[PDB]
């Protein structure tokens, strides 16, 4: 029950609740109810990334 996401562009965190990711990383979607910010899971981390940086793969 994992909805996968592709990171489209590098992103550097701007708060302690955000992730830093690189283009091509594959994440899991946790919550898409905010149009601008999605909560995601990657490695052992859970945090936010801007929705514009992500593509749903399912």
């Amino acid at each position: 029950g994992k909805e996968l996401l592709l990171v489209l562009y590098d992103y550097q965190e701007k708060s302690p609740r955000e992730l830093t990711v690189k283009k091509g990383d594959i994440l899991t979607l946790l919550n898409s109810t905010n149009k601008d910010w999605w909560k995601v899971e990657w490695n052992d981390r859970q945090g936010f990334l801007p929705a514009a940086y992500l593509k749903k793969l399912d």
Side-chain angles (χ1 to χ4, degrees), residues 10-45:
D10 294 349
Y11 182 78
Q12 300 87 51
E13 67 200 62
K14 295 278 127 83
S15 97
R17 282 151 301 276
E18 295 174 23
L19 301 187
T20 289
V21 292
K22 282 297 173 204
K23 174 190 217 170
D25 290 345
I26 304 298
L27 326 176
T28 293
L29 179 65
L30 296 178
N31 193 288
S32 54
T33 63
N34 186 318
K35 288 190 271 243
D36 298 329
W37 289 95
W38 290 356
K39 204 185 183 181
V40 304
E41 175 169 77
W42 184 48
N43 349 264
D44 287 354
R45 292 169 163 63

